Amino acid sequence: GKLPESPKRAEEIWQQSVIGDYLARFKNDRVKALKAMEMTWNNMEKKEKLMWIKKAAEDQKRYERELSEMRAPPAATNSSKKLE
């Protein structure tokens, strides 16, 4: 495929999700944002971490598809195929 996108499951769904409010607080606090997010993810365990993945992994699809599509003229019909 492509390039559509490429979520990132964990760091994607969540980072973008929080980093915006984390970077916003200090207006470029990223330093804190990255931690507040990193830590907060690891201290949690598989709970957060694993699940964060699926959020953007669940979202990653859209985007896989963008690509694949391409190549998935079939990967679209002949798979990419549909194809069943």
List the domain boundaries for the chain. Answer: 1-84
Q: Which fold has domain 1-84?
A: DNA Binding (I), subunit A (1.10.30)
Distances (CA, A) of 15 to 21, 42, 83: 10, 13, 36
Buried b (16+ CB within 10 A) or exposed e, 49-83: eebbbebbbebbeebbbbbbeeebeebbeeebeee
Do residues 78 and 7 make contact, with C-beta atoms less than 8 angstroms apart?
Answer: no
The structure tokens 């953007």 sit at: 56
Method: NMR
